[PDB]
Each structure stands twice: as structure tokens, then as C-alpha cells.
CSV table of C-alpha atoms and ligand atoms in Angstrom, one decimal:
chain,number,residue,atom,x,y,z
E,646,UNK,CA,173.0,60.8,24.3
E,647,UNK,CA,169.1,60.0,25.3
E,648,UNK,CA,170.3,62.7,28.5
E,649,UNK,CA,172.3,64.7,26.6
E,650,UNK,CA,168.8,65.7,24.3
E,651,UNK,CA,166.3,65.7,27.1
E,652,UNK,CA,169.2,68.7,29.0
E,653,UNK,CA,169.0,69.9,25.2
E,654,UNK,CA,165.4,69.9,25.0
E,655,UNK,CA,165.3,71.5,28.8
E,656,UNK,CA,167.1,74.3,27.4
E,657,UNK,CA,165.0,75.2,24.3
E,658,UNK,CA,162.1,74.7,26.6
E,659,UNK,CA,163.9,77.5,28.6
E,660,UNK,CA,165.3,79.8,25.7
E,661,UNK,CA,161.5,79.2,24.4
E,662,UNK,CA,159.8,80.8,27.8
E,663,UNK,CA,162.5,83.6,28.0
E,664,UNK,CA,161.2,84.8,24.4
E,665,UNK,CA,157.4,84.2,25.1
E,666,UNK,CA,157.1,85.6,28.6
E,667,UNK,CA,158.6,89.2,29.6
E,668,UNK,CA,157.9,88.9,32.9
E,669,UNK,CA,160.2,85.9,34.5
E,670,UNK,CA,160.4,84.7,37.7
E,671,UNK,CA,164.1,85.7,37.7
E,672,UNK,CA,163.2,89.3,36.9
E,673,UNK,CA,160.0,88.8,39.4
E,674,UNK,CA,162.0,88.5,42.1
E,675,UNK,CA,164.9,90.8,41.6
E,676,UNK,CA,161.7,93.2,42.1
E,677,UNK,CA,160.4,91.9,44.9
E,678,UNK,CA,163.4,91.3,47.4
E,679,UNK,CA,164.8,94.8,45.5
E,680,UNK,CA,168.0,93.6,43.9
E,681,UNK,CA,167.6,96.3,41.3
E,682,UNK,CA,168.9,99.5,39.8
E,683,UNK,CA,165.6,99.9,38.0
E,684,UNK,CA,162.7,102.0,39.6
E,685,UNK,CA,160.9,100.2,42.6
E,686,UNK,CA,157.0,98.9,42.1
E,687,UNK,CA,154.5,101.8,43.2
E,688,UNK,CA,152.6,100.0,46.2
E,689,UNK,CA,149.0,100.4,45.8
E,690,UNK,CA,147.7,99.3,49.4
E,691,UNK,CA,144.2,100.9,50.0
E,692,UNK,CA,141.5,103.0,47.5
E,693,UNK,CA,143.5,106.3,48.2
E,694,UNK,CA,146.5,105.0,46.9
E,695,UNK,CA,145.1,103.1,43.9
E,696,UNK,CA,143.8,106.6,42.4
E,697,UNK,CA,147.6,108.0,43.3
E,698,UNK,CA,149.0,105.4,41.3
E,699,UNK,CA,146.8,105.2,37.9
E,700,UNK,CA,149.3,106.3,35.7
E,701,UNK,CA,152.0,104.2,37.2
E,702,UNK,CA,150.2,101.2,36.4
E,703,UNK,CA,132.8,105.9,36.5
E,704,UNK,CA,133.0,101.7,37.6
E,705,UNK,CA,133.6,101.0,41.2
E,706,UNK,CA,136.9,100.3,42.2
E,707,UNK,CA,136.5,95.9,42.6
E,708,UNK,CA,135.0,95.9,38.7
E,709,UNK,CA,138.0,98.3,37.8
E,710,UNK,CA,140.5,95.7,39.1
E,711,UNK,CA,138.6,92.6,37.6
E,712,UNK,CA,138.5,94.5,34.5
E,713,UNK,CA,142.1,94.7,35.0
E,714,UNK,CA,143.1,90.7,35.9
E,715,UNK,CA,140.7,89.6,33.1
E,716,UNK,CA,143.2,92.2,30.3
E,717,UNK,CA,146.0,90.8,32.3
E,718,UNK,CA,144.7,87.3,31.5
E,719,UNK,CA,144.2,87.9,27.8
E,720,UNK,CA,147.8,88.9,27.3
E,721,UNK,CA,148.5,86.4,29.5
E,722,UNK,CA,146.8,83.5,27.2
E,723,UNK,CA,148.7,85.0,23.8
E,724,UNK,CA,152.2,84.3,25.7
E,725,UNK,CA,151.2,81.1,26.5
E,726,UNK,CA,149.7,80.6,22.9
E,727,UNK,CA,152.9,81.3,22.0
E,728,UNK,CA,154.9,79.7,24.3
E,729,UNK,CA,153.4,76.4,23.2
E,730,UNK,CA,153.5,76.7,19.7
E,731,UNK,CA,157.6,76.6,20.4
E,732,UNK,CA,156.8,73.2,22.1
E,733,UNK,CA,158.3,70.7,19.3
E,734,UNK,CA,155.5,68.4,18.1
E,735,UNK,CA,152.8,70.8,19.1
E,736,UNK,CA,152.0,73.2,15.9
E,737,UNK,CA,151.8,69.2,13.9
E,738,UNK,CA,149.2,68.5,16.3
E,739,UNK,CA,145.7,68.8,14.9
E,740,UNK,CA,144.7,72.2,14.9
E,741,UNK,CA,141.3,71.3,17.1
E,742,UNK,CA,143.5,69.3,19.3
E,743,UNK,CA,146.0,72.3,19.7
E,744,UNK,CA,142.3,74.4,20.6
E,745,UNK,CA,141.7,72.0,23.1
E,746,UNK,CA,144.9,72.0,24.9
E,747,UNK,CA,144.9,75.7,24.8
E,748,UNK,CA,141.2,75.6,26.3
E,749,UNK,CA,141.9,73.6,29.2
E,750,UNK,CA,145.5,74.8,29.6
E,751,UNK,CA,145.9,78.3,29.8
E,752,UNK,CA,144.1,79.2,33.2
E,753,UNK,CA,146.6,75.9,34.8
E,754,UNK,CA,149.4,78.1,33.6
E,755,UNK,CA,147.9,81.7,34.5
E,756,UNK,CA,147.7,80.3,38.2
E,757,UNK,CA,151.4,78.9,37.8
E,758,UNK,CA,152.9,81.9,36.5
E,759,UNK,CA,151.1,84.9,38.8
E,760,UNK,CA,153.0,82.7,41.7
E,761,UNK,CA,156.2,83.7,40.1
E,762,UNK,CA,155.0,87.4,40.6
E,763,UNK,CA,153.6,87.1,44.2
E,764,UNK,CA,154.8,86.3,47.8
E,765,UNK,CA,152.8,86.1,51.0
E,766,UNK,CA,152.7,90.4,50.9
E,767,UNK,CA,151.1,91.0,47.1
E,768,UNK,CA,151.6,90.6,43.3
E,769,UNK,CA,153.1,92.9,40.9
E,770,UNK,CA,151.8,94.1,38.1
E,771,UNK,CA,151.9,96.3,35.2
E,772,UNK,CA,155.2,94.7,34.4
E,773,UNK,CA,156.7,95.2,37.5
E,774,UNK,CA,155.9,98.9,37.9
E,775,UNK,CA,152.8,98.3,40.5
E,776,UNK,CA,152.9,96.0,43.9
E,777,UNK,CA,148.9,95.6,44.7
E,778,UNK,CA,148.7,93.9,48.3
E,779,UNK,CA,147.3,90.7,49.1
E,780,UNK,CA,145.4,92.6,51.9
E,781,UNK,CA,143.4,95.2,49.9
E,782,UNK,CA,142.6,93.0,47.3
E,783,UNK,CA,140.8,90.2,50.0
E,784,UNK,CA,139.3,93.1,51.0
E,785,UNK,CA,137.3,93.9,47.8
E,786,UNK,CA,133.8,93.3,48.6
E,787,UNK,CA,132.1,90.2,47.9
E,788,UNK,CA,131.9,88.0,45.3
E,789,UNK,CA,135.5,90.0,44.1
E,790,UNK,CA,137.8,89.1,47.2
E,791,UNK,CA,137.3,85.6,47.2
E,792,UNK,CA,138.2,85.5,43.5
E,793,UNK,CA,141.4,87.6,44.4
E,794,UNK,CA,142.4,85.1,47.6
E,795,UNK,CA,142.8,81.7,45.4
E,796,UNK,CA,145.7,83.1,43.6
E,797,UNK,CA,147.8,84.2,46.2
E,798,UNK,CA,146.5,80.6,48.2
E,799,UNK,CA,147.9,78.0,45.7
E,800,UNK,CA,151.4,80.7,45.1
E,801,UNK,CA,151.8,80.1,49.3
E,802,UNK,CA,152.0,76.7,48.7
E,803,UNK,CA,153.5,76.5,45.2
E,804,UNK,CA,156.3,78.8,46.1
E,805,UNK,CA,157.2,76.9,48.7
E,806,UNK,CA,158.7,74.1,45.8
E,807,UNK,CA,161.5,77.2,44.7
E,808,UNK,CA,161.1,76.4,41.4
E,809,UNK,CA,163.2,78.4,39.0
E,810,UNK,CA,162.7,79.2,35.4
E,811,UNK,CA,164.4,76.6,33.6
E,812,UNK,CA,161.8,74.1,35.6
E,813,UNK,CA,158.7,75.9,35.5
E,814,UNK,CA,159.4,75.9,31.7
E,815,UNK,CA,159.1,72.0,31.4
E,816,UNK,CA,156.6,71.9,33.9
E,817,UNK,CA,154.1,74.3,32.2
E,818,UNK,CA,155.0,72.5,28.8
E,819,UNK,CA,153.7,69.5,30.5
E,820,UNK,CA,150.7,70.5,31.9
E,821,UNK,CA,149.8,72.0,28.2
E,822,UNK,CA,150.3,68.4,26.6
E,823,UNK,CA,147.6,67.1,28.6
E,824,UNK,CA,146.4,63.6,26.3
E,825,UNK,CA,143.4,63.3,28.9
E,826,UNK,CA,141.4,67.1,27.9
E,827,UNK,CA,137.9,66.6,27.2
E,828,UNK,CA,137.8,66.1,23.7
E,829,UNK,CA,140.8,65.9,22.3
E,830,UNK,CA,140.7,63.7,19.0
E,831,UNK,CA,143.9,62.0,18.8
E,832,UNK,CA,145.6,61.6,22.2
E,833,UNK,CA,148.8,59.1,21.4
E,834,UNK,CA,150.8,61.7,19.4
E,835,UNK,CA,150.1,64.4,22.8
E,836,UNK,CA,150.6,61.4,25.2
E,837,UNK,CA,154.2,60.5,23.6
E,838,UNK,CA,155.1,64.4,23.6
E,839,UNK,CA,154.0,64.9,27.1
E,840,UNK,CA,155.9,61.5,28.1
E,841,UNK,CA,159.0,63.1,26.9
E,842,UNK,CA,158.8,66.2,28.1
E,843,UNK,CA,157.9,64.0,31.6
E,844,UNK,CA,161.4,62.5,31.2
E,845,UNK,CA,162.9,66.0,30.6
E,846,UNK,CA,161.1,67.3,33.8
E,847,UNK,CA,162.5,64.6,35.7
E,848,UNK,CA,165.7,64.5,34.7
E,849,UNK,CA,165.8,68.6,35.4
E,850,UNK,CA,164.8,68.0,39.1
E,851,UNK,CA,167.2,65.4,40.1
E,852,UNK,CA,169.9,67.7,38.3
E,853,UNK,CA,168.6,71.2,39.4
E,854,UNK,CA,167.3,70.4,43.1
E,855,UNK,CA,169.3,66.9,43.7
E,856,UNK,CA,168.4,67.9,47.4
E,857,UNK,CA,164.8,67.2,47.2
E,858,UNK,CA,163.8,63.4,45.7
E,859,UNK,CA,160.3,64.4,46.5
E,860,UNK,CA,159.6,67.5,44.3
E,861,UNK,CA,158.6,65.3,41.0
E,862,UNK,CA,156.2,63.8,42.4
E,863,UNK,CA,155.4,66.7,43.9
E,864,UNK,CA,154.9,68.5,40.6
E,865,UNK,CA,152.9,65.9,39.5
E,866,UNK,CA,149.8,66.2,42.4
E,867,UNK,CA,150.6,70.2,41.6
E,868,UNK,CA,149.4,69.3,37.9
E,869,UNK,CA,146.2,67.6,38.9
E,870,UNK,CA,144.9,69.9,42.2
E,871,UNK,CA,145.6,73.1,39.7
E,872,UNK,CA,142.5,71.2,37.7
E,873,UNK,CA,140.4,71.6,41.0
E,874,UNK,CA,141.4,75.1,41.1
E,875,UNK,CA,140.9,76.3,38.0
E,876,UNK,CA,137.1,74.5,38.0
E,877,UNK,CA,136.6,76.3,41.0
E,878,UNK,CA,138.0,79.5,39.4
E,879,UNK,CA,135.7,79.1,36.6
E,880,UNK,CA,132.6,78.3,39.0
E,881,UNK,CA,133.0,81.4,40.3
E,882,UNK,CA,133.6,83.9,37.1
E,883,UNK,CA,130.0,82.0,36.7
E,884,UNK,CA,128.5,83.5,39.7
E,885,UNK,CA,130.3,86.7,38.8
E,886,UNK,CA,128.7,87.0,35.6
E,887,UNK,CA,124.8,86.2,36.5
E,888,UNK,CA,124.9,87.8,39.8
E,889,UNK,CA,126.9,91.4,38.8
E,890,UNK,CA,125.1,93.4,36.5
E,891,UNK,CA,131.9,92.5,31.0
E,892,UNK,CA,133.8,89.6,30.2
E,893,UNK,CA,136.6,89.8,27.3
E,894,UNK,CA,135.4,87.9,24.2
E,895,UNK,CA,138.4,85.5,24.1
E,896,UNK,CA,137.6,84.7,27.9
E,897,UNK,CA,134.5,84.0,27.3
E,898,UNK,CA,135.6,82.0,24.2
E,899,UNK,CA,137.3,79.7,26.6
E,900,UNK,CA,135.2,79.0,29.3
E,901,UNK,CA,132.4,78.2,27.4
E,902,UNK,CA,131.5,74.5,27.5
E,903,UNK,CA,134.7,74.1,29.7
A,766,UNK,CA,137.7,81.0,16.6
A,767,UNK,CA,140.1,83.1,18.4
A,768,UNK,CA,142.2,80.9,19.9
A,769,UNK,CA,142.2,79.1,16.3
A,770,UNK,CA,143.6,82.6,15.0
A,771,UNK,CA,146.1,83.2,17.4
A,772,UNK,CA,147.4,79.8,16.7
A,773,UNK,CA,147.6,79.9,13.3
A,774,UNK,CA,149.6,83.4,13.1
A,775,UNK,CA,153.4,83.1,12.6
G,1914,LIG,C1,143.2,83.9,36.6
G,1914,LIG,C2,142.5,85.2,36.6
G,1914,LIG,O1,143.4,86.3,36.3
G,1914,LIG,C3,144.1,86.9,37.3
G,1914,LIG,C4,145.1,87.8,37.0
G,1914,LIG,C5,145.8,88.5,37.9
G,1914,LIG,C6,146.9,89.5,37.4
G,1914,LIG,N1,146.4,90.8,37.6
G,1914,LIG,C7,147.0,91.9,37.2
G,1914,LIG,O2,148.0,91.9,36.5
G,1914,LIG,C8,146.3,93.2,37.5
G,1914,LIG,C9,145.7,93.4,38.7
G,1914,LIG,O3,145.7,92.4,39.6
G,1914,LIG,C10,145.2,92.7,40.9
G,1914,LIG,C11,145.1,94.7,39.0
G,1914,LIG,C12,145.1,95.7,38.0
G,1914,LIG,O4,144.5,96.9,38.3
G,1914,LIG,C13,145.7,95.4,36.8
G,1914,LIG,C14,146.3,94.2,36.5
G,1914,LIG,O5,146.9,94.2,35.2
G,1914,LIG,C15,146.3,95.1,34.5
G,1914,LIG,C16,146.1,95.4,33.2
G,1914,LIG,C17,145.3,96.5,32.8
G,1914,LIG,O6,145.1,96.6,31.4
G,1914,LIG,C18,144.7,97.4,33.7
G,1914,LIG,C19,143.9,98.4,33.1
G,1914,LIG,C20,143.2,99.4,34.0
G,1914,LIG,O7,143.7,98.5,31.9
G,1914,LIG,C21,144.9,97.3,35.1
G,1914,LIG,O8,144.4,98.0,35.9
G,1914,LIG,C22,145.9,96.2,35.5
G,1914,LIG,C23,147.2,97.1,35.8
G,1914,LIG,C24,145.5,88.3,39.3
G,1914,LIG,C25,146.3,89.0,40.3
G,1914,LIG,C26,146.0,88.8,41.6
G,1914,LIG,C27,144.9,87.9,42.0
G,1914,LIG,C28,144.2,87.3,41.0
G,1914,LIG,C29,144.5,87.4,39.7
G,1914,LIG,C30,143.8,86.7,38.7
């Protein structure tokens, strides 16, 4: 019975993450290896065919595309609002508290869930309708290509796990009930959550991937380098924003003091 | 704040 409800909780987790988040791994790559009736991604590959392809998906062309990440990001961070409000326990969670985890959370998850949309070749975007290469965004001047290049670095690696849906749904429900973000007020009742939801991660590899004992604990170092990452993410949008002559208020809402 | 407001909406 104590299986029976963590497979149970596994699946609302799931059920949960096909409501919140349009754009599944599932549907990502039925894109991208073209196992679809629907209309193939318009492949923007250089400057000349980024200006074809505005409508398919007086600023110079690297600000236009940060402009268009950060947008991305913002919808991006109301899924995942949402997404974790369907986590049971978390909307009973002090309201600060449930700030906090969103704070230090969303940009863990936002590098977790583009890898679902990239391979080695590019990322789509715009739902699906545009494939921007990995090449011509590296090749956005500096400091904007080496804010483009991290993303598609940790998906490499974090592909490389062939996680599905149903698991990156208890994984990114983990790594939001976090009981060790800075300042969090009362860390038992997110520390017995997360402990669950640890159990129901578990429990979903051995079943799911019984081929590979190591990916767990795998998952687990994934959790703590994507706190590297992101501080090294946020380092930069830093130096993007004293050294380039906009950032989205709710972006700049969580970074600050982060 | 806004993440307060998007968390409190239904
Ligand atoms: C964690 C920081 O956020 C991110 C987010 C993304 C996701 N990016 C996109 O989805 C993404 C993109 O992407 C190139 C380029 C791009 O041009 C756009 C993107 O999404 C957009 C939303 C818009 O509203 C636009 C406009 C004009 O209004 C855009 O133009 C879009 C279509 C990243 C994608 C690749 C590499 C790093 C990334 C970092």
C-alpha cells in the first residue's frame, strides 16, 4: 500500500506537469526526430533567416533574442508557479516559504526543462514552430553567446540520463521542495514533503529505468551542480546588466538578493 | 510581490 500511493502520487505528479506545461518532452521530441503530421519547426540558422522567420516565431539582433529567452523565462516561471502549487502540501506551506522556493527554484527548473526542448543541433521555440541552432546562437557576440552556450552544455549531459516525463515530473517537484533555500522559515514541513516525493522518485527509477541502478543517485548530484549553474547564470545576467546599456520586472524580482 | 500574486491566484 506505502508503493501503491508513492506510483499514485507519481502519477498525479505526472497528470499535474501535463496540465501546467504545454510543451512536454514527449511532444518535444516527436518535433525534433519528426514523428509528426503537424507542420515542421522553421529553422532559423543565421541573421538572414531569423528576419525570414519573424512571423513564424530597431535593437540589434543578440538583445532581440535575450529579450526573447528572458519572455520565454517569464511564462516559463508562471507554469512552474503552477506546477508546484499542484504539489500536495505546498499551497499549506507558508506563503514566504512558498516565495522562497519559488525564488531559488524556478531557474533549476528553466535549465531542466529547455533540455527537454534541445539536442546537440538547437532548441525549439515558439511552441515548437521555430528550431534556433546551437551554432548561431554561440555565435552571438559577446557577453550574449556565452549566456546562450550553458543551456545547451548541461542538456548534453542531462539528456544523456533519457529521462521521460513521468520522471522529470518528480524530479522537478523535488528540486522545488528544497528545505535548505536561504531563508526559508520553517524547513521540517518542506523537508518531510521533499522526503516523500524522494521516495516516489526512487521508487519511479527502479520501475521506469530498472536497467540503470545508477541514475538516482545520479539525479541527486544533477540537483546540486544545477545550483552551480544557475549562480553562474545569475553572475552573468549581472554583468549583462551593468555592462550593456531591459530586464522583465518579475526577473528582476527574483534575482534580487538571490 | 509578484511571485506572491501569482501564487495566491486560483
Ligand atoms: C534561463 C534563461 O532563459 C533561457 C530561455 C531560453 C528559451 N528561449 C526561447 O524560447 C526563445 C529564444 O531562444 C533562443 C529565442 C527567441 O527569439 C524567442 C524565444 O522565445 C520567445 C518569446 C518571445 O516572446 C519572443 C519575442 C520576440 O517576443 C521571441 O523572439 C522568442 C520566440 C533559452 C534558449 C536557448 C538558450 C538559452 C536560453 C535561456
Amino acid at each position: 500500500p506505502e508503493s501503491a500511493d508513492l506510483r499514485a502520487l507519481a502519477k498525479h505528479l505526472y497528470d499535474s506537469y501535463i496540465k501546467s506545461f504545454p510543451l512536454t518532452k514527449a511532444k518535444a521530441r516527436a518535433i525534433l526526430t519528426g514523428k509528426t503530421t503537424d507542420k515542421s519547426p522553421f529553422v532559423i540558422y543565421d541573421m538572414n533567416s531569423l528576419m525570414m522567420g519573424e512571423d513564424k516565431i530597431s535593437k540589434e539582433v543578440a538583445i532581440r533574442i535575450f529579450q526573447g529567452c528572458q519572455f520565454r523565462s517569464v511564462e516559463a516561471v508562471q507554469e512552474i508557479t503552477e506546477y508546484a502549487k499542484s504539489i500536495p502540501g505546498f499551497v499549506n506551506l507558508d506563503l514566504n516559504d512558498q516565495v522562497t522556493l519559488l525564488k531559488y527554484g524556478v531557474h533549476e527548473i528553466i535549465y531542466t526543462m529547455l533540455a527537454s526542448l534541445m539536442n546537440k543541433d538547437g532548441v525549439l521555440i515558439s511552441e515548437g514552430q521555430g528550431f534556433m541552432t546551437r551554432e548561431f546562437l554561440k555565435s552571438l557576440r559577446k557577453p550574449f553567446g556565452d549566456f546562450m552556450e550553458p543551456k545547451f552544455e548541461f542538456a548534453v549531459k542531462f539528456n544523456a540520463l533519457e529521462l521521460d516525463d513521468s520522471d522529470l515530473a518528480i524530479f522537478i517537484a523535488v528540486i522545488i521542495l528544497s528545505g535548505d533555500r536561504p531563508g526559508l522559515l520553517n524547513v521540517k514541513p518542506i523537508e518531510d514533503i521533499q522526503d516523500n516525493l524522494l521516495q516516489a522518485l526512487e521508487l519511479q527509477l527502479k520501475l521506469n529505468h530498472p536497467e540503470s541502478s545508477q541514475l538516482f543517485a545520479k539525479l541527486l548530484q544533477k540537483m546540486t551542480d544545477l545550483r552551480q549553474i544557475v549562480t553562474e547564470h545569475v553572475q552573468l545576467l549581472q554583468v549583462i546588466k551593468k555592462t550593456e546599456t531591459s530586464l522583465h520586472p518579475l526577473l528582476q524580482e527574483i534575482y534580487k538578493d538571490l | 510581490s509578484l511571485l506572491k500574486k501569482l501564487l495566491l491566484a486560483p
